[model samples]
Target: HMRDEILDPSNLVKNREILYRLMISQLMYDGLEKFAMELSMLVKADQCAPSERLLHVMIAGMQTLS
Candidate 1:
């Protein structure tokens, strides 16, 4: 349900495309060392299945720093 909402046809394509571009920018323009640390902390604190849609949001935020 939740995963459907986030990963549905209405949302996933745009979000994933944008995130992928942003991640590349961050890796090439900014760098990922700090981002990786923060992402690791967030994943640790999430306490949810990585399969969850919420985890996708968390990862998206980590990618875009949103």
Candidate 2:
């Protein structure tokens, strides 16, 4: 359980940026029992996947632009 915090930001310097034009970013969902179930469901389900997946889809789209 303790190891689950690996990406939870160890310190202030751990702050992440997406570059000047916003290259990449991630929405992390973790902690507790109930929250875990929600993130799991976030995998499929067309209605919700669109919200969670558009960013990732945009990544592929950007690669094509260059």
Candidate 3:
């Protein structure tokens, strides 16, 4: 999922955490603010879990972004 891959700290660009969150709101939620509240918890769940099909797709998403 783009959300997971984007949320994953490992995948973030150096020092781009701020922009990364922006991207998530823009790309995933169309500027929805609730994402922040939701993700506060979702990340905990993610740390505990991947289906790395996520990696495969995330790589694709990154490639497109680049």
Q: Candidate 1, residues 3-63: lDDT per residue as tens digits?
A: 3433345687566654443343343334455654465464342121223333455677699
* Deviation from native of the Cα of residue 5 in model 2, angstroms: 35
Could you tell me how far off, in angstroms, the CA of residue 24 lies in candidate 1 after the best superposition? 0.5
Using all chains and alpha carbons, the TM-scores for the candidates as numbered come to 0.31, 0.24, 0.25
Residue 53, model 3: Cα distance from true site in angstroms:
1.0
- Give model 3 RMSD, 1 decimal: 11.3
Estimate every model's Cα lDDT from 0 to 1: 0.45, 0.33, 0.44
Q: Using TM-score, rank the candidates from best to worst.
A: 1, 3, 2
The model with the greater TM-score, 1 or 2, is: 1
Per-residue lDDT for 31 in model 3? 40
Off by over 4 Å in 2: 1-50
How accurate locally is residue 9 in candidate 3, as Cα lDDT from 0 to 100?
Answer: 58
For model 3, where is the 10-residue window of minimal lDDT? 43-52
State the lDDT of candidate 2 residue by residue for 1-66, as single tens digits.
211224344554332321111111113211233443454464422111112233554688699888
Off by over 4 Å in 1: 1-10, 31-66
Error (Å) of candidate 1 at residue 33 is 14
Model 3, residue 63: C-alpha shift (Å): 0.4
